[PDB]
Design an enzyme around this catalytic site. Structure first.
Site, short mmCIF file in Angstrom:
data_model
loop_
_atom_site.label_atom_id
_atom_site.label_comp_id
_atom_site.label_asym_id
_atom_site.label_seq_id
_atom_site.Cartn_x
_atom_site.Cartn_y
_atom_site.Cartn_z
N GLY E 70 0.83 -1.19 0.00
CA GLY E 70 0.00 0.00 0.00
C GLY E 70 0.87 1.24 0.00
O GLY E 70 2.03 1.19 -0.42
N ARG E 71 0.33 2.36 0.47
CA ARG E 71 1.07 3.62 0.53
C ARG E 71 1.76 3.77 1.89
O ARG E 71 2.65 4.60 2.05
CB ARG E 71 0.13 4.81 0.32
CG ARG E 71 -0.49 4.92 -1.05
CD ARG E 71 -1.40 6.14 -1.10
NE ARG E 71 -1.91 6.43 -2.44
CZ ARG E 71 -2.71 7.46 -2.72
NH1 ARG E 71 -3.09 8.29 -1.77
NH2 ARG E 71 -3.12 7.65 -3.97
N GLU E 74 5.83 3.96 2.46
CA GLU E 74 6.54 5.20 2.20
C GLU E 74 6.54 6.16 3.38
O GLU E 74 7.39 7.04 3.47
CB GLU E 74 5.97 5.89 0.95
CG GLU E 74 6.80 5.60 -0.29
CD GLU E 74 6.32 6.37 -1.51
OE1 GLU E 74 5.94 7.54 -1.36
OE2 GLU E 74 6.33 5.80 -2.61
N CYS E 100 4.30 -6.39 -2.17
CA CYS E 100 4.03 -5.10 -2.81
C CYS E 100 5.06 -4.02 -2.49
O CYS E 100 6.23 -4.14 -2.88
CB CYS E 100 2.62 -4.63 -2.41
SG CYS E 100 1.93 -3.31 -3.43
N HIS E 101 4.65 -2.96 -1.79
CA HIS E 101 5.57 -1.88 -1.42
C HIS E 101 6.20 -2.14 -0.05
O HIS E 101 7.09 -1.41 0.39
CB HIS E 101 4.85 -0.53 -1.39
CG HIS E 101 4.54 0.03 -2.74
ND1 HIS E 101 3.48 -0.40 -3.51
CD2 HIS E 101 5.17 0.99 -3.47
CE1 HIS E 101 3.46 0.27 -4.65
NE2 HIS E 101 4.48 1.11 -4.65
N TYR E 120 6.44 -5.15 -5.68
CA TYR E 120 5.56 -4.55 -6.66
C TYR E 120 6.50 -4.23 -7.82
O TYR E 120 7.53 -3.59 -7.62
CB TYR E 120 4.95 -3.26 -6.10
CG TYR E 120 4.13 -2.47 -7.10
CD1 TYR E 120 2.99 -3.01 -7.69
CD2 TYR E 120 4.50 -1.17 -7.46
CE1 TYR E 120 2.23 -2.28 -8.60
CE2 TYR E 120 3.75 -0.43 -8.37
CZ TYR E 120 2.62 -0.99 -8.93
OH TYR E 120 1.87 -0.25 -9.82
#
EC number: 3.5.1.124
Lengths: 166, 166, 166, 166, 166, 166
Positions: E70-71, E74, E100-101, E120
């Site tokens: 997801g976000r 970060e 993913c991330h 990802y």
């Protein structure tokens, strides 16, 4: 009696749905006119089917007019055909109900000078500049023109319009 | 030069953010004024902080005015202080930039009688009724008043306003 | 001067719209390039039309490059043609402006080794690992490469890029 | 007459708002009861103020009951107090109007065995298992119980309920 | 075995919920760590409760680590405490699952040089620049590090991680 | 083993995705059946591809059945073919897993009289009226029927269902 609605995408959902059913209760036939066939969607997500386009509407075939609010009026008021429908029906003295931003269509039709009514408070100055003696009331009855301000006025709005149609 | 912005929640995001940064680039001090301190959010979700409230604004302290569009103008135009700020600054001949629904505030200030400009096409009839000679151009310059229509006009809008402030 | 933008769906709205109009103001020709023709939509809903596809882009035909942020760079950086466009233009010493996640495309192009710039702080480690001397500044100018971090840096970002194109 | 509404968050917007105004038109007093004071929001985003909580409701102080649909009934039916209110009022013979998922509260009240009515077609099997003679019609009138199926039935729903309160 | 999750608002909903339950099935205790107490919400709207903050976490009290995508990564990768948790647990050879991330957190921990895994596809170049020999497979097992790419890989991802925990 | 899923638009995302991957992990083949080919979207926005339509399903070609929750069951239970599939498979003694609103399909199939299980607490009264001995537990196992209540029960739900398919 046949009641016509002039609206489009982004109409205030309850300002269209409430009068639609309230009038059907009385036995009146209700019709939804918009730019194109298919369906339109309110700002809150309700979807309604369009009965006919502005171009296919013959003002003489309808007896009353309802103008819901929302963002739709600002787009409808730029359509020559839709505006002429409202101008003719209103000037012919037929019953016309408006609420919220709905009267912007009448402003554009150029038929409001000297008339008494209300609208969404946010555009009261535009109603005034069009020659309207603006009143801050849940519902105003000026001959064939019944107007209200916001969704909270719905009960009073159709209470008066229904009487006019009786 | 100190530039004041009169806006509120539901402002058209880019119509506020673009001029804010464009003017900041030139070295001008930009101030966001609204109903209350804190932050306000645009139609598209962008959040910006409020520098001062309408009540704390002294027109004589600012040199130019910017009026972004969106749904905010219809709420701002109902605030007496906000409208008086616009009326004073516009009347004094200070540079005023408006776009989309932004000029609805100028309509309420009663300063557009006999002036020339533009706006979101949806309210051209209201501008006309207020005494404006409405022009369908990406940007119009009438003395201290620089006006545009939609987000697509941004480049021409500030291009002319920046010149006015130079 | 002809400015090319490499972007796609889910771009950071203002990071694309701001430079687009700012450069258009100067008289520069701005072109939006993406995967397919038609339109693309930003994270916040703003829609913009695509001028040409990556495949139809000839680097030698453009004089400057702009790389907006958002989620788009992570998709664009996987397109060989798009990456080659950036690599060529950057390598030729043509002005290149990047902001937020935009430089992820430059990372993939393999041109940042030994360069100095900035980006969205969240990916500073990736910039560093690519050989960038990462600076926490609103705008950094390293030869032909002008970089910024977030939307709050817009004013300084184009202020420096415009000078480069003058 | 004093009309009580048993509902909560995620109510079908128009199934609450329509009867609310239609009944107010007649001069009836309408009260919204839910889990807590403050406001509740419909599935489509409309917000309404809660007049009183289930705990503060005395069935004997109200003359009629309205049960809007949506997702709210499945939560309201788990509140023993709310269910006891519906059971009391319904079994006492007071007018009760239900639509969509609204009757799930009556199923839980255990007062539908041998009764005739309708509901959202999706839960017809549950109404049947509760002893209801399920009818597929826009409106059904069985003594004090007036029931309808979907928003499209609003006009007929209140047409009949209003007659009951007269 | 006690499994710790390092995540935050905007996590990819299923990449957190799937492993959470899949591991609970085996009898493992699962804990959600984030910036603050209360709850966090996924990009798709699922809400989960935070068990403890990054600051209150003692790496030595946990046996395995899971990094959803997801976000969130970060933002998490910029938190010194969260990164140190991952650096210690990973370097100690404890089981670490990423998708993913999620591995962006490991990149920042500086422990991936020479390791074999995936992520990802959009950040494969950043994984490579960190010294990872990137593989495009639904699941890669490199000692204590089990990695996957997207939600479609969920079945294979935990199939391998569960084995490692047995 | 071939596992069939009966669902549609507005399914509870994780109640479909979780069992889908958990079962694939074991090597079982999973098939999504709905009203039409193409894709269906969960209430939270996840999109999944439909493998076949209800009309093309032959109950005898599948070994197990999974009934996810959400709003989909109330629509699926109105499709006579979908209901016949569930009735056939369930009455034949094939493993059937249900959660949340999922068992509404079994209620409509008429196969729950005298059986023991659970569901979303909001519809417990309907399960009871259908002849179910309703149990408030994370998971209930009654022969071929494994049932759970909410997403928080996922781990226990499949823990038991997997054992059944072994």
């Amino acid at each position: 009696m046949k009641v016509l609605f002039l609206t489009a995408n982004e109409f205030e959902d309850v300002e269209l749905i409430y009068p639609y059913h309230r009038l059907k209760e009385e036995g009146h036939e209700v019709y939804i006119a918009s730019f194109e066939r298919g369906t339109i969607t309110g700002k809150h997500g309700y979807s309604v089917k369009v009965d006919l386009t502005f171009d296919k509407v013959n003002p003489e075939e309808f007896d009353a007019l309802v103008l819901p609010g929302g963002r739709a009026p600002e787009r409808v008021r730029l359509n020559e055909k839709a505006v002429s429908i409202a101008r003719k029906m209103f000037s012919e003295g037929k019953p016309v109900a408006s609420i919220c931003h709905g009267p912007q269509i009448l402003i554009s039709a150029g038929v409001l000078r000297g008339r008494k009514g209300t609208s969404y408070p946010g555009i009261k100055d535009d109603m005034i500049n069009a020659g309207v003696e603006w009143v801050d009331a849940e519902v105003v009855v000026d001959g064939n023109w019944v107007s209200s301000r916001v969704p909270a006025d719905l009960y009073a709005w159709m209470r008066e319009f229904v009487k006019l149609l009786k």
